[PDB]
């Protein structure tokens, strides 16, 4: 792989790692609440293992 492209690839990968996305926070703190509430609403209760 020519280094110019190689330099580009590590660059774009770095950019992805720097995006200030909200999803990871939502998974850890907010999504569980939504599940906990909706569990009482669906016609079929949750079934886990």
């Amino acid at each position: 792989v020519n280094d110019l492209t190689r330099r580009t690839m590590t660059g774009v990968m770095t950019a992805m790692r720097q995006v200030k996305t909200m999803t990871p926070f939502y998974i850890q703190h907010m999504c569980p609440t939504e599940l906990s509430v909706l569990a009482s609403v669906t016609v079929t209760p949750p079934f886990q293992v």
Partner: protein, 50 residues
Amino acid sequence: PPNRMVYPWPNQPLPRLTVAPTYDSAMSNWISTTIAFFIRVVNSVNMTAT
């Protein structure tokens, strides 16, 4: 106090002879240091990776 005014920058009395651009005024100093800082920012590792 009466007959006085405040001023955000340092000030001097009016010059005597012809004017010319200078480089020791407060604003000029503020400009130079600001530029110097950002240049340092651009060369920081964070920029180099991308």
